[PDB]
Amino acid sequence: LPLARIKKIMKLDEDVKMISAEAPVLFAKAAQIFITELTLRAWIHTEDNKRRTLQRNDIAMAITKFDQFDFLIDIVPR
């Protein structure tokens, strides 16, 4: 993952002007872990529906079943 893009995302927050060099590195790995778990969880619903294509509604469903994804409830609602 390109670190400059991660830094740009962090700076969308107006109050974030100075970021350590190590922060984006941590996020690069965190993003991989997050995408993997989120995808795996969405796929549970894809399979439950006997589908072979992962859809946004599968992600919305997954979000409602994992406390760690509470912050996404209004971002990807069912």
């Binding site: 927050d13 350590s20 995408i35 072979r52």
Partner: protein, 87 residues
Amino acid sequence: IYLPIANVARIMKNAIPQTGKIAKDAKECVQECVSEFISFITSEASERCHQEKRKTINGEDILFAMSTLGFDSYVEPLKLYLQKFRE
């Protein structure tokens, strides 16, 4: 602002069956979620940084935020990754 869709899609593909497929809309959804994830953690890390009388958000601030916000399981793996990255 999002991480490149190709990078996101590659990681997504590795998490499902070889013959599984992903709708374009779902890739874009994950892109949205990833940026929201980074912003969520960063906001808390920024608060921590400020409370510690600092201005540059550091690795400890990020890890503190992850542990505080419900992502403590990410901490050890991240520490190992950063250590290997800088060794």
